[PDB]
Subunit: 317 residues, 6 copies
């Protein structure tokens, strides 16, 4: 083709993900030392958000500035579909910016945008997956690799609801050959189709996956990860409804961390509902890496933007 | 004076419009070859939008980045008029940005902004005209000039409603000495005052204009252009109402294109209502140049911004 | 510490404020001569607005571009507090931008943001004070210093309501050793706590302050300053209610200016309600400096941003 | 291969030379309008001079600065050949600069440098030819094209000694399909091998060439070109010796220009020996373009450097 | 005209020299604070040296880099005059660099270069004067202004030979309205024509000048300045010859400084012959400012280059 | 202190040398990928050469351009010492450039320059040592580390004369904990004082050193290094004299390489005298890394310049 998209890590090999991590960490280190590599000079990113965002939006906008380009915030309601067709919007934006991202209510919207645009398209989260979160989370696990452990020998346990972030964490950990668990209650577990995709990743990678409601599954976790309980932006569970499903068994508290292990690190994509999926004590505690993880939303987005723009330039000399 | 505005092409000569085209195409060619001329370094554009926009807004914001400056999106509701007077807003913005554009509900708002501001002001569309569309459309017609034809010998036919874009296309084609037709139904034709202005342009240019409901008027068109049927943002015609006025006589379909001529190119400012003013077959067909035309919204805005900033610097050494 | 904030000028000495003025005016002069000092290259400012703004918002966004960085407009409703705690938002933004500003409904919000963020935080106005307005106003008074007068011998009279801008003007004038008066009606005067803070400033500076409803207080003013009468954004006084309190005694009209003195300059933070706190004749008259003052919102913000980023870099080598 | 050299225009087609002219003139026009295209950013040119130079050396050094790179002056005596072999010098410099030029006493030296270096090598003049002079001279003739004439219908007459510049002018004019004459005395005419190469160029181009001692050959010249009479830097003819050969028949004086034609333009590569090959009256006269021609040494070198670096980057992605 | 030269300060007013000082010191302060104003971006300076130089040459070359341009070192022997006429060299260089300087054996050479070039020409020292030294020395005296003294009330005494630097110091001090003395032995004093020029400066400035062999003339000097005794580069006095003329009466030693005054500062253009015109004790002593003075060769050259390029751009829009 | 010099690696620890290698290789990799880190923006390097140079001079000049600064070539004969004292030259240059290097005839000259200058001074080779060669050579050995070997287990054998490069190679290899041999004839071996310094390095590093005329010493070398036989620039041995001392025993030929080992790499600082210290077959052969080594003169100089400028900025905030 003449471009590459980042809609799902399912289209990336382990080697490509490692390259993305390595590129991201090199850029991070330069900036830490006071030097900003101008790798996207005069390039323009269209940023389409159908939902609210702090970390994803600010990461894209900051990343562009840091690398010498600019991000344009197209707020909820440039509509995807509607009166103007997605084919028209996609072809028009392909002439007016160099690269696109979109956070979408429905996954088909990002797929359609990628299919119809002739410039790189990045999924900034859908109801299905969250691939920039995957890369940031991988950067974070690499930086916080336990002493004497290979990445592939790490155990990553996601606690709670089968969110798009849960699935995405499963996708990236299995892609990298790691050991993944979704610890969640029946009715809120990764589904058969999700699990088939995790198995497919493991066939190649030698990693493992388990989906279970067994509380002992947290034992030996190197990373213990959670997310909110209220579901999707269009149809939230109420406090009473979600507490009924998840509390207290799926609350990440100090007792759960102690059971997972003394050096187990706590992760959360954020925003967090303190007192539901995680207690103040854990998220603010010595083993929380969620703020390093949030920083790495920017770390990973810088590397990804550069990778995709380099690919585009290679295909369009 | 100490600045120049771009409110209407009525204040520009043919020679100035050619200069704007030539400048725009030089910048376009540089960028096509991977080089971004930093002609607006550290300059700031205030972008006031009273209505939704994809092409105009993204073109301004991208243009500024590409040329080394920045565009600020001032969303619907910095009010023009209201509690704070237009004189105050204009004088204040003149101290805080280098150049302004505004897409306005009512033409007097852009006129007032231009009259009261001491920096260049650009009309990003009003209920009266659409002069940046004119320049982009002219760039497009120049690029797609038929073999063996001079620009002045081209025939440009606008089909349908007497929109501000219809009038603007009349203004630019007549300014350049071309042959213009508005093919539209009685009651929805360019009015007496519009036509007097077209005649005035032709007195100088030697071009021609005709406003007619004769379907044979499309015959021999080099460019066949249309726009939506629903009218102005504040007071849309319903689907039933606009179909009653315009359908099927004013639908640009393959039969109309065949009648216009085999090499006639289709143009539309966009967004398009597929199945009303144009069929899928035409807009997606081999003779459609509307996506090149959309790209040239950015092409023309880059040249215009540079022209106006150069003029400002010449007057304010 | 590892950063410095700009929440109130109460934490700045006279010498520091002079340094800020001098830095701001040097940058202004360079730009006047066509040279843009790239003092914030690749730096990112998060701009959180809980209320509407023309001058503050555009000043921050333009300042960043002029100095080689970028400002991100985070529109009303990234919430401060709410579902996601202020501690979380603050720590997250500290990883994703280099510097923050916020215009807040309630002062505690900016205090909390500053306390929880590890990057510099700037108050873009609260219900308590308006410190960037202070610096811009000081730059303006320095530029318009009366012939043969020291800054400290100037008399600055604020007319009307005890707005946050009124208090801020009191804070800066007393900090610089000048003579301040709030001329306002009983019930709408700077309160006991405000006045205690002004007295504290004067203990150090040798300046003076008076809060009074005596109309003779305007006599001998070098600067006569006013603001709107309708109160705070969340709870406005109606036209009838505010006219009943303030009109005509507190209307700045030509007669009041004549009484203050022939060379007294008129100031207003803007937006102004013409016909209430000021007449057209005064604000558009020969002794009005409110548009120079508005320009100096940008002048002062450039200097402040550079000062705070330099401080940050000094503390984080 | 992995690079391209500019040792002789014999390896360039007419289309490539036109491209070089067009690129050079676009860059010239940008700079005339105050804009410097940064097309060689951070690139380093090694400049090896075995002989003195004003125009060639300054053109290369200025060109690099203008385009965002740098030229290094390697003065007579980094030796080519000698104790360190040319193979070693060439391979070493290929690691330490991006592009090379050399003005050489003997043509084999530039050939050897080009053959052994893996970066582009440019001939800055040898005893055989002078290809950057060719391109500058072509740019000059294009700019000064007579009214109503095609380039190919122009007549270019070189007067005097069969210098490397004489031969080079023959090479470029015949490559472009023009009509060339060397008007020179027997014993000092382009030799049989030179003429065979001119005939070979004309076989492709349809141009013409003549080598003659007939004074009537100047009649109808559009460009009349000359050079010094003293021969090569290592073995100059004395004043008496060269006057005996060339004077007065080959002196370009006003009478010769009048005979050539009223609009014939005078060219000289410079430095000129006033009173020998040209009189003060001609070189300082209204029809002299030698200073425009000297400027175009820089014009052409900018275009060439960019062309060769672009070619290198295309071959080494 | 279309440019301005800097051949002698005789063509500059006191106000222009103050502007040059002020500009130079602003640039110096920026660089001291770590910021390099890019005021000469992509501009090229030709640097012609007929004599050796450390301070002048390095100052020009460094200044260009610091301000975003480049200086080209044209070493002794691009000849001025000779085989190629000065008119030709001047016109050719005017096409190939933006600005020129030259250090020349004979003053007429710099005059001829300035007269024939259409770009700014700067005198880098001749046998007559040294105007960049003047500006650097003035910057130095301003920075080291004695407490409680105006510039005009300062006494500047040059000791020793009537060098071009001696005369230049007389020219600048008298231009600025200061009090100048040349303390030198009969036969080696500023001549009648020099003194007539100093008187002419004083007619305008109200300054004073004296040329004398009275040793009491050093008393009350604020600045005591000297230079070498060996004369001009082409015809040096031997050690014995110059000692016979000048030693010990004109040796600046600690006794002379004590007599001049406790706060008198020692200046020397450098290079110095330690043990002749100055002792180690003085030049390395607490009251020596010659290294600050040497730094200000660069300070002044930066300001001058910018001033002349700005003037050129103003005249050639 | 307020700066750091690079006169000898004797003042650097193993950890510092590793840091220098790592920094150099990061910069090299960026440039290989088409990105030039602007780490020395607007910085000026004075380059003083008392002897001829290709690799050192071009490396410094190119390095400065690549990193956004500039190098000034001060050719043989700004004299160090002489009429103007070294103290004066050093103090003057400290005001006029940011960093200095010098290639000197006598080591005391670089020591004096470093001691008297207040800016970083780099030794570009003396009669004693060659520390930039050390760093380039170390970068080269790291890049060409044999499979399955640690740097410290490598054997490096220098063949021939006890040149400054021989000693320097001993210094760096022993500093890094490697195993060094000088294989050279009696009378031309590293002397007692050299060897005492190598022993001192080994006391810390655990490396080894041997100085011997035993031809079996080459056996097991991982790197086999040589240099010219003619001695120092001021007093060369003739061909007959040096052949008498060194030939054929110390000629690096294919037989010697075969004896050293099949994967032993050949190194030479260059220029090489082919047919003396090395045969064509070896230097042009598959195991020669001398051109990679020459490239790494630039690799190492980039890292060193950045390291020293960063150190300077840290000490002079
Ligand atoms: N399951 C959650 C996932 C939120 C991911 N968070 C982020 O990407 C951080 P942001 O929203 O601040 O960009 C949901 O559906 O809302
Ligand atoms: N008659 C139409 C004109 C739309 C012009 N379109 C554009 O300028 C493209 P945009 O809206 O995406 O900027 C109307 O009044 O709506
Ligand atoms: N008392 C007024 C203060 C307005 C200050 N104005 C500004 O800062 C100018 P802006 O709102 O355009 O940024 C109020 O509470 O509204
Ligand atoms: N036949 C002459 C050619 C000189 C060409 N001149 C130039 O290239 C101008 P320059 O020497 O100033 O670079 C000779 O052999 O000397
Ligand atoms: N009278 C002395 C003047 C030297 C001025 N010195 C300088 O300009 C310093 P520089 O030579 O290092 O540039 C002479 O004729 O030599
Ligand atoms: N022993 C040799 C060392 C030469 C080192 N070579 C280099 O540094 C390469 P260069 O001279 O090209 O910079 C001698 O004394 O000459
Ligand atoms: Ni922006
Ligand atoms: Ni240079």
């Amino acid at each position: 083709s003449m471009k590459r998209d980042y809609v799902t890590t399912e289209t990336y090999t382990k080697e490509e993900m490692h390259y993305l991590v390595d590129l991201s960490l090199k850029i991070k280190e330069a900036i830490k030392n006071g030097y900003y590599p101008q790798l996207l000079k005069n390039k323009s990113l269209g940023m389409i958000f159908q939902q609210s965002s702090t970390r994803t939006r600010v990461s894209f906008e900051t990343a562009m500035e840091q690398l010498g380009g600019h991000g344009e915030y197209l707020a909820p309601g440039i509509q995807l579909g509607g009166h103007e067709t997605i084919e028209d919007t996609s072809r028009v934006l392909s002439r007016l910016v160099d690269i696109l991202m979109a956070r979408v209510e429905r996954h088909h919207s990002i797929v359609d945008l990628a299919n119809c645009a002739t410039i790189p398209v990045i999924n900034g989260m859908s109801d299905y997956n969250h691939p920039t979160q995957e890369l940031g989370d991988l950067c974070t696990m690499v930086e916080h690799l336990p002493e004497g452990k290979k990445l592939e020998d790490c155990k990553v346990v996601f606690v709670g609801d089968a969110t798009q972030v849960c699935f995405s964490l499963g996708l990236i950990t299995t892609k990298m050959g790691m050991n993944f668990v979704h610890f969640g209650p029946e009715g809120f577990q990764l589904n058969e189709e999700h699990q088939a995709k995790l198995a497919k990743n493991c066939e190649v990678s030698g990693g493992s996956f388990l989906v279970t409601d067994d509380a002992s599954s947290v034992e030996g976790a190197d990373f213990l990860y959670t997310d909110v309980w209220y579901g999707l932006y269009e149809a939230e569970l109420s406090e009473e409804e979600r507490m009924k499903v998840f509390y207290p068994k799926y609350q990440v508290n100090q007792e759960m961390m102690d059971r997972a292990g003394a050096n187990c690190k706590f992760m959360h994509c954020l925003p967090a509902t303190r007192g539901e999926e995680v207690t103040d004590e854990v998220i603010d505690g010595k083993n929380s890496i969620c703020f390093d993880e949030a920083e790495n939303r920017l770390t990973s987005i810088r590397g990804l933007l550069v990778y995709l723009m380099n690919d585009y330039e290679a295909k369009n000399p």
